Enzyme design. Structure first.
Site, short mmCIF file in Angstrom:
data_model
loop_
_atom_site.label_atom_id
_atom_site.label_comp_id
_atom_site.label_asym_id
_atom_site.label_seq_id
_atom_site.Cartn_x
_atom_site.Cartn_y
_atom_site.Cartn_z
N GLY A 1 -7.46 10.52 1.62
CA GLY A 1 -7.87 11.09 0.59
C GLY A 1 -7.62 12.66 0.28
O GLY A 1 -8.45 13.19 -0.27
N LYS B 1 -4.82 14.04 -0.73
CA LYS B 1 -4.08 14.17 -1.84
C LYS B 1 -5.24 14.20 -3.01
O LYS B 1 -4.99 15.03 -4.14
CB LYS B 1 -2.89 13.30 -1.96
CG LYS B 1 -2.54 12.55 -0.45
CD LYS B 1 -1.40 13.76 -0.08
CE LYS B 1 -0.25 13.60 -0.63
NZ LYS B 1 0.36 12.15 -0.83
N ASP C 1 -4.43 -4.27 -5.12
CA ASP C 1 -2.98 -3.97 -4.89
C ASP C 1 -2.38 -3.23 -6.13
O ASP C 1 -2.67 -3.64 -7.05
CB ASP C 1 -2.30 -5.28 -4.77
CG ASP C 1 -1.29 -5.62 -3.42
OD1 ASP C 1 -0.49 -4.54 -3.44
OD2 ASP C 1 -1.36 -6.60 -2.82
N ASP D 1 2.14 7.44 -2.83
CA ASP D 1 2.16 7.55 -1.49
C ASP D 1 2.46 6.34 -0.80
O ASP D 1 1.67 5.56 -0.05
CB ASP D 1 1.41 8.49 -0.84
CG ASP D 1 1.94 9.16 0.54
OD1 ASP D 1 3.12 8.93 0.98
OD2 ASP D 1 1.24 9.83 1.12
N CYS E 1 6.74 8.96 3.51
CA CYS E 1 6.60 9.78 4.93
C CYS E 1 7.68 9.25 5.96
O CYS E 1 7.44 9.05 7.12
CB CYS E 1 5.24 9.48 5.45
SG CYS E 1 3.89 9.93 4.65
#
Lengths: 207, 324
Positions: free
Chosen positions: B131, B133, B178, B195, B252
């Site tokens: 949370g 971002k 989803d 992300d 990432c």
RNA sequence: GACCCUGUUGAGCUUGACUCUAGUUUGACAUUGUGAAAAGACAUAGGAGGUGUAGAAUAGGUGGGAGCUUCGGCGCCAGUGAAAUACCACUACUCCUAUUGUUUUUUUACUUAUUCAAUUGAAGACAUUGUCAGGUGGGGAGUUCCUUUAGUCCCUCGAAAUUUGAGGCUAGAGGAGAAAAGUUACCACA
């Protein structure tokens, strides 16, 4: 295809292209096949063999992976046969076996030795497009190597162009155009459709 | 030789044989050794200042008044504050409980400033598991517009709702969807953010399981899932808007199947996407070709972030524009 | 005293049915035009590229091919590489230019649409409007299949230099109804 057009270009190859170029290489030609709209990333990928009883390339760098009852015949016929201790040596060093894989253009393996090949050097040699053909129970090394060789592997890759080099100037014209006719018929049959599926056929020489 | 280098590296660092081979390839040899130091090494701790309740200087003064040793980090961020030492625990300070500042990493900062969120704009986040971002994006629109928080796991959602309502966000709705299914639900956003679930090679300090527990099979399904994740991002945004809206792709991971391959697949399948300069101050350009395969030269505008150059986690940032 | 129980109250936990629909919402298509200025996309015709690593190197790629050969430079080879350079043979992307055009937007106005006063003026191509394709629906009207697991690795959609993922199909096990219900080695009270 038109048989008159085939005669036109093989007359244009031999000997108009021989007169124009005066080739100093090994005199051979190749066929290049282009196709319009067959996506190589899709399904029904094709991989077949074309039985050509002509042997277009005489300088055919041949070796065998032979078990017993082949040492005396290979030595008489000038064929390099390696015993089980040699493959163990060729499995110890992987740089040497890759170098002779570039040197020797075809591998012939027996029934028991191809069961012994996938231990550790199987997948190592499988990443070259170097599938070894297996022998049969006839065990006649004469004229089976000739039948195993000149078997063109029509393999589909991710590029939309494909070439196969067959046919020398020392052989007769009637036999080579039979090789060309047999090759394009098996190529059409192996494809997803007929003669519509191909777009262009270039039967020009290497030089 | 190379083979001796791979066996020695896998023995001394404890990597898997596969993932060490992949990571050795993308680097020059001495650059690989300096990278293996840093990614195993823990990263500095960074603080994001809530612009809503406080600002950079008075929060900094307050935490030193509670004994926290800080330093403004970089000229990149007017919002970031590095920590060095703290007598009081960071979550214990009453500034934290009010939501004056939030724990983050450096790599959580840069996708948000890659985006340029404006007021009264409809925005999105397909994965907002910690949370940070989402709270950063709402700090930029000054409590306006609407953020659609999304995360496919209910367990992470409790920390999301706890973090959002502490920070005073008042403009975010959180759904357990989803995100492949998400443009069918709404579509028509301005600035979407993604992300993606990734291999996690970019950060091994937080998750040391990727040393070995990441193999050939995992490197096929996981970049496969980013593709359906990423094609949904174009198919959900608006081709035109009163304020122009852009996609941002943030992973990432430092892998090449996860990064610079998915963006090639997206820009090929959807020709109504362009990529321009991404607005982050520094970085390294993406590779136009890695293993015999060519990507379009728009990837020179993409920025890659590395543990060895910057004390940040391994990251990829790319921003998209929608045409039609 | 611990400890067990009963009732009320909190903390939960599991539910609280199906079909159309009010409401509400996303996308698409029209009224909704006329100019200018730009910008972009593709339509063709030209020009030029390219340095992840290593390799001496600004390696698109691909078919072959080992001196095609003007100097024997370049070759061959050797490395180095996923891919290797000589030679001819093919065709990709990008960035520019052009006109050998179709366009799409943005801005600027105007009203040739559209909406109010009026019952001729302003806004102004904005809204607004309607139709399709969806999301939700504790609301309104009626009404009384999914879950766990495996296989067909068979079919469909994806993805991958050839193997995967998601749906389909099949088979071992389960089932008076938005007003409120069952449960906890839990909390406060009696």
């Amino acid at each position: 295809i038109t048989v008159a057009g085939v005669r036109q270009n093989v007359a244009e190859l031999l000997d108009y292209s021989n007169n124009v170029k005066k080739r100093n290489f090994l005199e051979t030609v190749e066929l290049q096949i282009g196709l319009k709209n067959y996506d190589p990333q899709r399904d029904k990928r094709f991989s077949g063999t074309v039985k050509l009883p002509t042997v277009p390339r005489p300088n055919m760098s041949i070796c065998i992976l032979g078990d017993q009852h082949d040492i005396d015949r290979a030595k008489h016929g000038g064929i390099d046969a390696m015993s089980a201790d040699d493959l163990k040596k060729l499995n110890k060093n992987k740089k040497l076996i890759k170098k002779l894989a570039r040197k020797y253009d075809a591998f012939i393996a027996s029934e028991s030795l191809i069961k012994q090949i996938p231990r550790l050097l199987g997948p190592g040699l499988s990443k070259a497009g170097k599938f070894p053909t297996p022998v049969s129970h006839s065990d006649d090394l004469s004229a089976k190597v000739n039948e195993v060789k000149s078997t063109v592997k029509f393999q589909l890759k991710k590029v939309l162009c494909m070439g196969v080099a067959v046919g020398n100037v020392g052989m007769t014209q009637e036999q080579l155009v039979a090789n060309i006719m047999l090759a394009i018929n098996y190529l059409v049959s192996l494809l997803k459709k007929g003669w519509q599926n191909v777009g262009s056929l270039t039967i020009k020489a290497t030089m | 030789y190379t083979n001796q280098l791979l066996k020695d590296i896998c023995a001394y660092y404890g990597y898997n044989e596969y993932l060490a081979e992949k990571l050795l390839n993308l680097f020059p040899p001495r650059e690989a050794f300096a990278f293996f130091e840093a990614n195993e090494t823990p990263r500095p701790v960074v603080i994001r200042t809530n612009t809503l309740r406080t600002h950079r200087r008075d929060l900094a003064q307050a935490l030193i008044n509670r004994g926290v040793t800080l330093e403004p980090v970089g000229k990149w961020s007017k919002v970031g504050l590095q920590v060095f030492d703290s007598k009081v625990p960071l979550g214990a300070t009453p500034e934290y409980l009010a939501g004056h500042y939030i724990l983050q990493a450096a790599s959580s900062f840069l996708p948000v400033m890659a985006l340029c969120p404006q007021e009264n704009e409809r925005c999105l986040d397909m994965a907002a598991a910690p949370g940070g971002k989402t709270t950063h994006m709402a700090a930029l629109m000054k409590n306006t517009g609407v953020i659609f928080a999304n995360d496919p796991s209910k367990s992470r959602a409790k920390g999301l709702i706890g973090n959002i309502h502490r920070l005073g966000v008042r403009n975010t709705i959180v759904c357990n969807y989803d995100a492949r299914e998400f443009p069918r639900v709404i579509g028509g956003f301005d600035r979407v953010l993604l992300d993606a679930p990734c291999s996690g090679t970019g950060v091994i300090c937080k998750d040391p399981s990727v040393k070995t527990n990441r193999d050939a099979k995992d490197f096929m399904q996981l970049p496969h899932t980013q593709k359906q994740l990423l094609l949904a991002a174009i198919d959900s945004c608006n081709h035109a808007s009163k304020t122009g809206g852009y996609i941002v792709y943030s992973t990432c991971s430092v892998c090449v199947e996860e990064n610079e391959e998915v963006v090639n697949y997206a820009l090929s399948r959807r020709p109504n996407v362009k990529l321009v300069e991404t607005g982050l101050p520094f970085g390294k350009e993406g590779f136009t070709s890695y293993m015999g395969k060519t990507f379009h030269p728009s990837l020179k505008l993409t920025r890659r972030f590395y543990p060895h150059l910057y004390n940040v986690d391994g990251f990829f940032v790319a921003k998209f524009k929608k045409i039609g």
